[PDB]
Design a protein around this ligand. Structure first.
Ligand SMILES: Cc1ncc(COP(=O)(O)O)c(CN[C@@H](CO)C(=O)O)c1O
Ligand SMILES: C=C(/N=C/c1c(COP(=O)(O)O)cnc(C)c1O)C(=O)O
Ligand code: NA
Ligand code: NA
Ligand code: NA
Lengths: 383, 385
């Protein structure tokens, strides 16, 4: 329910029954063998898990510091980590008797992931997406339509992700009987922060096995970009009790932390309640609209488990600017032949700065959360 | 050098020195423990091998016939089978002491795959691409640019794949000392048809071990699309000596085989000599090469690899065609029914597998080689609908 004080379930009474049913359905099927057989089966044969753990030898040597490894979620079917959570929840939804999946999306990766999982399982799919994000990630919109999903543009309010979430919750109150709300990050009311983190933990578990195989020891640091926090929690979670392993979350610094145009909730937000949770939100009392060049990081909030990890000081949280993200995007494309997602490039940008201060014997794993194909128009205009 | 009558090394004498040195180099490194360690290391940790073999249960059950498995080369880093050959040749090129890679591309996937392998191994990359194809696949050109490769638009002749190959050969004549011409299909003079098939054969060795895990037996049919023929040979070749496994190559039927606007060389092409090889081509009355058409820009090569010409003659493989319309219906069908957006090339193989599955028993197995993902083809499918 809570992580320290953070998290909770601050929702209208209409949503208590649904969320309790989800929580019981989950608690039941969480370790049902037939459920975990089907999940592993689709993750392996349809999604392509396990993803590899790539030693970036040229990047490492150019920096001349720590050994930089990349956990390659860019290679997951769909092109990002989001698919891991989309399969899990859609399978749960199907076993709960639901015939419809709804979801919010910003970058379009979760919307596509939900459409793909929906198409796979023969469920109807309606995706709520802000109009600024529709035009900014147009490829993902046509993919959702081709996958059989319906994309619903939200022009209201700020006309972006925050407002996409508001529309989806409004839908789910009206349709929860047959509709499952497939939330795409470690956000929202309980049980969602826990469910999304659990379905993303596979990343960290693989990466742990893979780095012991490659290097014969645990990594010194793990770096992952933080929007709502799902790819970061996924890779973080199985190393939480390895005290020697530092954990670093990288938020969108946008035009700069002192500019008022970023998405660093943990770094510069205030504690507050929104979308059913207590966590950090950017705010003026009223919640601020955020900015990032990476549309997947463009969310005022952040997941409560990160808010908790920051407070107990288990994880460190930093930021990286738009300019620094774009530079990591080109650096990685040219030096390693991997075109990263702009969200992921934040992680890469900080890992390259951090690698320089660390020694040749030391080890950093970067969660490469997605591929950059969706961002080609953005990087092209930015040029 | 030969596959029956087909293949050979039909080139000018200036290309004989370069080809002999490549042929020598390959023979040396083909079985070298260190070369195969490095190739597999990059194929695993960087390219993401092995790819899975996916049972399309929903499509299977819709058709109500044979079991349809998809070999998921769409999940390979880059989004196509082309990366397998690109890494193999780029690494071979590096061990030969080359510093620069050139390649043709039509669809852009081979160019991207070459640009990727070149970035990985710290080599210069110039990609030859027909000006018609540059405008047609603008995003793949930007991907190549972002990867540090130069894209040289070809304005000579038809401004297509055939011409990009001709531009690439002219460059390689001059530059062979330090440049490797990285050909992206099982075409061209020896040793290219052999090398490319060898570097794509990992597809079939995986698919065989995977289908024996999944079903305890070999498949009844293997279906793959055929442009030049590399994704098809990759998946076919490990099954050649398993006599019970039928092999089907699916060519671009285009607007129709009788429309004069297609790319089925084996089906409606004539025997001929071009680009260093004796094989099937689409020809004019004079005997020169004819321009090809397909909605899938990857099946735009007017010829086809000589081992496919050979396999056809001895009747080991059957070759068929699928029209533009049938490939489009398969593109939408797989996306909606399985949540996999296939490349338009691959969609030809899916389209025929749907028709073949229907007229077969439930207990029979069809492996389709899903050669790429469809992210590159979204502009094309939008205009088509
Ligand atoms: C995804 C995909 N599937 C299939 C093919 C057909 O080539 P093959 O017959 O060599 O496999 C191509 C061709 N691609 C070549 C020729 O246009 C290129 O330059 O990229 C492809 O991109
Ligand atoms: C907001 C979205 N994208 C998020 C995203 C993120 C940020 O979400 P998490 O912090 O939950 O991983 C990171 N990396 C990639 C590739 C992403 O697409 C979305 O797909 O709706
Ligand atoms: Na945020
Ligand atoms: Na894999
Ligand atoms: Na052809």
């Amino acid at each position: 329910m809570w992580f320290g004080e953070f998290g909770g379930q601050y929702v209208p009474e209409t949503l208590v029954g649904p969320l309790k049913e989800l929580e019981k359905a989950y608690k039941r099927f969480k370790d049902d063998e037939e459920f975990n057989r089907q999940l592993n089966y689709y993750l392996k044969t349809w999604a392509g898990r396990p993803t590899p753990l790539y030693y970036a030898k040229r990047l490492t040597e150019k920096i001349g510091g720590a050994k930089v490894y990349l956990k390659r979620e860019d290679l997951v079917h769909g092109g990002a980590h989001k698919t891991n959570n989309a399969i899990g929840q859609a399978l749960l939804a199907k076993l709960m008797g639901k015939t419809r999946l709804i979801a919010e999306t910003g970058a379009g990766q979760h919307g596509v992931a939900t459409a793909m999982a929906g198409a796979l399982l023969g469920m109807k799919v309606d995706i709520y997406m802000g109009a600024e994000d529709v035009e900014r990630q147009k490829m993902n919109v046509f993919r959702m339509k081709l996958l059989g999903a319906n994309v619903i543009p939200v022009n209201s309010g700020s006309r972006t992700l925050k407002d996409a979430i508001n529309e989806a919750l409004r839908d789910w109150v009206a349709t929860f009987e047959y509709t499952h709300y497939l939330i795409g990050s470690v956000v929202g009311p309980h049980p969602y922060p826990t469910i999304v983190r659990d379905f993303q933990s596979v990343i960290g578990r693989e990466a742990k096995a893979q780095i012991l195989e490659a290097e014969g020891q645990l990594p010194d640091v793990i770096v992952a970009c933080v929007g709502g926090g799902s790819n970061a929690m996924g890779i973080f979670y199985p190393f939480v009790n390895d005290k020697k392993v530092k954990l670093v979350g990288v938020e969108a610094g946008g035009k700069g932390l002192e500019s008022g145009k970023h998405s660093a909730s943990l770094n510069a937000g205030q504690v507050g309640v929104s979308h059913g949770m207590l966590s950090y939100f950017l705010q003026d009392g009223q919640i601020k609209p955020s900015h990032s060049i990476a549309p997947g990081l463009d969310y005022p909030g952040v997941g409560p488990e990160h808010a908790y990890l920051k407070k107990i000081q288990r994880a460190e949280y930093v930021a990286v600017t738009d300019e620094e993200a774009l530079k990591a995007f080109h650096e990685l494309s040219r030096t390693e032949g991997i075109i990263p997602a702009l969200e992921s490039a934040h992680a890469v940008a900080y890992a390259m700065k951090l690698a320089k201060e660390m020694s040749r014997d030391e080890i950093i794993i970067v969660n490469l959360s997605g591929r950059g194909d969706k961002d080609l128009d953005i990087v092209l205009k930015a040029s």
